[model samples]
Target: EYHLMNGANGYLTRVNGKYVYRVTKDPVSAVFGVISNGWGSAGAGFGPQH
Candidate 1:
């Protein structure tokens, strides 16, 4: 009982091809959960119009 936001974001850390969207369906908990709620590449104006 002492892992909180510490256990769900390490196994598949922030590495290249961070295909988090394809890593696990648990985005609502780990990978994305720790990376600012997947905002690291899901939220914000993460699109391209150029």
Candidate 2:
């Protein structure tokens, strides 16, 4: 996840905001969304909404 959140290629933080490096941003963001949707709180990634 380092490459996803660090250096000139990291697409996590900036991509989330899209202030810069938006070229391949959606590609990584899409994958993250897919994983969360498929995994969910049931998968132990998250447990409570509140």
Candidate 3:
């Protein structure tokens, strides 16, 4: 029950490298909830601030 895509990560589909099919664990309870209520885009100093 996870499919909030568009750059919010946690998407996978592998088969035969140990045999897995699909998995998307995005924002799941905000990823077990509790990183200051986790919602992102603090890019100013983290990625794009030039």
Score residue 16 of candidate 3 by CA lDDT.
42
lDDT of 3: 0.41
Per-residue C-alpha lDDT of model 1 across residues 1-50, encoded as one tens digit per residue: 34585776555566534565456655344544556654544454444424
Model 3 clash pairs are: none
TM-score of each: 0.16, 0.29, 0.15
Tens-digit lDDT track of model 2 for 1-50: 45545565554545656543573465665557758678555554454325
Q: After superposition, how far is residue 32 of candidate 2 from its true place, in Å?
A: 0.3
lDDT for each candidate structure: 0.52, 0.55, 0.41
Rank list by lDDT: 2, 1, 3
Displacement of residue 37 (Cα, Å) in model 3 is 3.1
User: How do the residues 1-50 of candidate 3 rate in per-residue lDDT, one tens digit apiece?
Assistant: 44654433333432343332222234433334435666655664334347
Deviating ranges (above 4 Å) for candidate 2:
1-17, 20-25, 39-50
Clashes of each: 0, 0, 0
User: Candidate 3's error at 24, in angstroms?
Assistant: 34
